[PDB]
Amino acid sequence: PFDYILSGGTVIDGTNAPGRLADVGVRGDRIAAVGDLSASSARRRIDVAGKVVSPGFIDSHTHDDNYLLKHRDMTPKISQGVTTVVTGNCGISLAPLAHANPPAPLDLLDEGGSFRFARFSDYLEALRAAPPAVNAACMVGHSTLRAAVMPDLRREATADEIQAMQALADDALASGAIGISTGAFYPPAAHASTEEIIEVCRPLITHGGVYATHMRDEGEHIVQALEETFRIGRELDVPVVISHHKVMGKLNFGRSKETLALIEAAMASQDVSLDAYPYVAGSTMLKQDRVLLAGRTLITWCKPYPELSGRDLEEIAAERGKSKYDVVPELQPAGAIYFMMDEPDVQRILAFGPTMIGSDGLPHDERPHPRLWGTFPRVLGHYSRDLGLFPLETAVWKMTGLTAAKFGLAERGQVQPGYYADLVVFDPATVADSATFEHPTERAAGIHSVYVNGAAVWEDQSFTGQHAGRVLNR
Ligand SMILES: [Zn+2]
């Protein structure tokens, strides 16, 4: 007999097909059957009339590396329907690095002494021994590798340093990492050359992993950064994933037309993917950057002056008699939210066929960007239903089947017999992001229940206590 059947709802199967009335039966960690299951014995037949049963949402871009260890409930994600997270993005991974004061932006993962894993395998073992509520597909970050190996980050790595970093990356992949990410936009890797990145990432071909990247620049020089990324992909001969695609700064508004055209052209000749979050503001370390600081900027946390959390940086700066750019050093380390994108570009990028959804949530932040709690329902409700940017099945595909295919997460991302029972039950009419910039931790509406490997992890608007997630391999 099946353990349970989600009966009477509409199945949106993750393959980008209009929903159809069908039941979903689960046995253990697997979807046993899909269709009219009235004739199948089941221990429970759960009524989900009026709801959609879809595959669990796979987050396209997280910084949950440490959150998985410290807050196993993973409430910000499971409350949104997320069942799997891709970690170790933008060159930032929790492991391998034993360091009491890692360089920003690695601090976005730190709760205080969190960087304690000398080997990547140590980190994966900790996850497997105390599993989180969601599955984890983990990448190793090139900036973490530089921090672990280089005595001086302000220059290109020597061959010896490249050898040490490549060895750590190869061990990580052998242990289960699904790829390597870079973020040369950030200080720890700003001096890394294209060749350094290529040499450290060589093992991806041998292990069948992916190359993910926070491009070197996402503004004035985004074409050069895209070309660098495509070149790295061709040299590595592995799939590339462009993280949180955007065009930032007023001088670049509207340029999504140009960037998406370059990406679409590259996709015709090499393997390229991209993801994005559904908002007009970014968030990361507080950084002295003319473009990030051009517009409205809010502080998310601040080490030297904790009282600044939540404040408007222009006010802080002006009261200190400085521009935002000049006041930044005295406030570091800190985090911020930057209103530097334009709605038409965000919509064009979200609607671009291949764009996967990634929240880019920064879970340890005191006053976080709402994308941490509202990304997926914002796409399903606001964008799909309310604005009609894409039909619901396409919005679901962009956070399920597409993502599972690009990251190579076998037997996940689709409601198919034999696949793992990572599932979401949501009300298409009411699903909505409730988190706002003012109240960024509000739980989404319309998420009825969420299942990971067949076990309910979210029910009655609460974590069930099921630590059902698994560390995944490509
Ligand atoms: Zn990034």
Are 406 and 273 in contact by the 8 Å Cβ rule? The answer is yes
Task: Report whether 210 contacts 241 (CB < 8 A).
Answer: yes
Q: How far is CA 426 from CA 11, 49, 56, 375, 458, in A?
A: 11, 11, 11, 15, 12
- Among the listed residues 17, 54, 99, 46, the one whose alpha carbon sits nearest the alpha carbon of residue 425: 54
Q: Examine the fold and report which residue of 310, 338, 366 is the final residue of a domain before the chain moves on.
A: 338
Question: Would residue 474 count as lying in a domain?
Answer: no
For residue 127, the CA-to-ligand 1 centroid distance in Å is 23
195 is in an annotated binding site: yes
Query: Is residue 345 located within the same domain as residue 358?
Result: yes
The CATH number covering residue 454 comes to 2.30.40.10
Residue 95 within any structural domain of the chain: yes
CATH of the domain at 372: 3.20.20.140
Same domain, 28 and 136: no
Q: For residues 341 and 180, what is the distance between their CA atoms, to the nearest angstrom?
A: 27
Q: What's the 219 CA to ligand 1 centre distance in angstroms?
A: 13
Does residue 132 have a cis peptide bond before it, meaning omega lies within 30 degrees of 0? no
Q: Are residues 327 and 363 in the same domain?
A: no
Order of strands across the sheet that contains 45-47: 30-35, 23-27, 4-7, 45-47
How many angstroms separate the alpha carbon of residue 312 from the centre of ligand 1?
22
Q: Is residue 423 part of a domain?
A: yes
The CATH number that applies at residue 294 is 3.30.1490.130
- The reply to whether 439 sits in an annotated binding site is no
What distance in Å separates the CA atoms of residue 271 and residue 471, rounded to the nearest whole number? 25
Nearest-Å Rg of the Cα atoms of the chain is 21
Q: Quick one: how far is CA 176 from the chain centroid? A: 18
In a domain, 46, yes or no: yes
Alpha-carbon dihedral 55, 56, 58, 62, rounded to 10 degrees: 170
CA of 69 to the centre of ligand 1 (A): 21
Ligand-binding site membership of 191 (annotated): no
Which residue, 323, 338, 353, sits at the end of a domain?
338
Structure tokens at 351: 């609607």
207 is in an annotated binding site: yes
Q: Is 269 exposed, middle or buried (0-12, 13-18, 19+ CB in 10 A)?
A: exposed
Residue 96 CA to chain centroid, in angstroms?
20
- 448 annotated among ligand-binding-site residues: no
C-alpha 218 to ligand 1 mean position (Å):
10
Determine the Cα–Cα distance for residues 442 and 446; give it in Å rounded to an integer.
Answer: 13
Examine the domain organization and report whether 69 and 207 are in the same domain. Answer: yes
Are 57 and 14 in contact by the 8 Å Cβ rule? The answer is no
Residues 180 and 250 in one domain: yes
Nearest-angstrom CA–CA distance, 441 and 361: 11
Q: How far is the CA of 48 from the centre of ligand 1 (A)?
A: 38
Answer for the pair 400, 13: CB distance below 8 angstroms, yes or no.
no
Distance 288 CA to ligand 1 centre (A): 16
Environment of ion ligand 1 (residues, CB < 5 A) = 90, 214
In a domain, 433, yes or no: no
How far, in Å, from the CA of 337 to the mean position of ligand 1? 13
Compute, in angstroms, the gap from residue 292 CA to the centroid of ligand 1.
Answer: 13
Q: Position 319: which residue type?
A: E
Q: Which of 320, 338, 356 is the last residue of a domain?
A: 338
The strand pairing partners of 33, in sequence order, are: 25
Q: 429, 450, 426: which is closest to 9 by C-alpha?
A: 426
Q: How many Å lie between the centroid of ligand 1 and the Cα of residue 186?
A: 9
Q: Any idea how long the chain is?
A: 474
| Alpha-carbon separation of residue 210 from 173, 255, 273 (angstroms) | 10, 27, 10
Q: Is 99 known as a binding-site position? A: no
Solved by what technique? X-ray
* Backbone dihedral angles phi then psi of residue 238, each to the nearest 5 degrees: -140, 165
Ligand 1 centroid–CA 12 distance in Å is 30
Resolution in A: 1.4
Residues 323 and 230 in one domain: no
Q: Are residues 107 and 206 in the same domain?
A: yes
Is 90 marked as a binding-site residue?
yes
* 107 belongs to an annotated ligand binding site: no
Six token digits for residue 298: 């809010």
Within this chain, do residues 230 and 138 fall inside the same structural domain, yes or no? yes
- Closest Cα partner for 356 from 414, 393, 401? 401
Does residue 26 sit in the same domain as residue 87? no
- Identify any residues that bridge with 27 across adjacent strands, giving them in sequence order: 30
Shared domain check, 349 and 319: no
Q: Is residue 472 part of a domain?
A: no
Expressed in angstroms and rounded, the spacing between residue 282 Cα and the centre of ligand 1 is 9
Tracing tokens 């997270």 back to the chain, one arrives at 85
Q: Work out how many domains the chain is built from and give that number.
A: 3
* Euclidean distance between CA atoms 179 and 203, whole angstroms: 9
The parent domain of residue 460 ranges over: 1-54+414-427+446-464
138 and 239 within one domain: yes
Cα–Cα distance measured from residue 83 to residue 217, given in angstroms and rounded to the nearest whole number = 31
Query: Measured between alpha carbons, how far is 87 from 451 in angstroms, rounded to an integer?
Result: 20
267 within domain boundaries: yes
- Residue 237, annotated ligand binder? yes
Say whether both 214 and 332 belong to one domain.
no
Residue in 51, 32, 27, 71 with CA at minimum distance from that of residue 361: 71
Q: Which token pair is 160?
A: 């010896």
